[PDB]
Design a protein around this ligand. Structure first.
Ligand SMILES: [Mn+2]
Length: 242
């Protein structure tokens, strides 16, 4: 019946999760328009997603995606060149079009020992915002920022999603890998590694042992070393389809 159809539409709104989509229905909030007239029932997120519904639905061609990546890469560089920033996802893998952006970021100042340096992220979030790259914010945490951005014009672009994550320098690589994917490639790689006596996750690559209950994180300073640990020729990102 023409209502299940409603819950579904809700969830189409970033922010609006299921349990959240339901209560909204209970207020009779079902359509797009039912939302619009009711910004008060929604969080900043949900409101933002809704503001951007339409654009959020479109995809990013790499022509754009790249120009985006230029901007992120360049700005972090001027705040502090000790900032490593890899925009990952399918995109990295040559994908012709992308859903969202996701910048992975690190700084040697930050390791899995400090954990308390949101300014590290913030500073860029703020930086990105003064340029009018990031144009809205969904949810800005200490280690991760969900927001919205948009390329500049001279006369326009949709608002893409953008995620920036802060990762320790001692775990960046593993994560650069992991958010690189594809989901399959990770499975297989994670699958291969297991055989050599290793366990790779999004943070580390640990050596296994007897009864599995084991690990103690090998140093990683490039994605390359991951591969070396498990001796597989490094497959460039483009060759990680499976
Ligand atoms: Mn994302």
């Amino acid at each position: 019946d023409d209502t299940s159809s409603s819950i579904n539409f809700l969830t189409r709104v970033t922010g609006i999760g299921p349990s959240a989509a339901r209560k909204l229905v209970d207020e009779g909030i079902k359509t797009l328009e039912d939302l619009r007239k009711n910004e008060d029932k929604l969080n900043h997120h949900q409101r933002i997603g809704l503001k951007y519904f339409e654009d959020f639905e479109k995809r990013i061609p790499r022509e754009e995606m790249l120009q985006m990546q230029d901007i992120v890469l360049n700005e972090v560089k001027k705040l502090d060149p000790e900032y490593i920033a890899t925009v990952c996802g399918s995109f990295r893998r040559g994908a012709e079009s992308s859903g969202d952006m996701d910048v992975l970021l690190t700084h040697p100042n930050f390791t899995s020992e400090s954990s308390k340096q949101p300014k590290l992220l913030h500073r860029v979030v703020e930086q990105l915002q003064k340029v009018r790259f990031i144009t809205d914010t969904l949810s800005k945490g200490e280690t991760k920022f969900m927001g919205v951005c948009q390329l500049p014009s001279e006369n326009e672009y949709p608002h893409r999603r953008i995620d920036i994550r802060l990762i320790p320098k001692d775990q960046y690589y593993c994560g650069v890998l992991y958010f690189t994917g594809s989901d399959i490639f990770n499975k297989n790689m994670r699958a291969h590694a297991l055989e050599k006596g290793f366990t790779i996750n999004e943070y580390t690559i640990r050596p296994l042992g007897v009864t599995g209950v084991a690990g103690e994180p090998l140093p990683v300073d490039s994605e390359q070393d991951i591969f070396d640990y498990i001796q597989w020729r490094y497959r460039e990102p483009k060759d990680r389809s499976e």
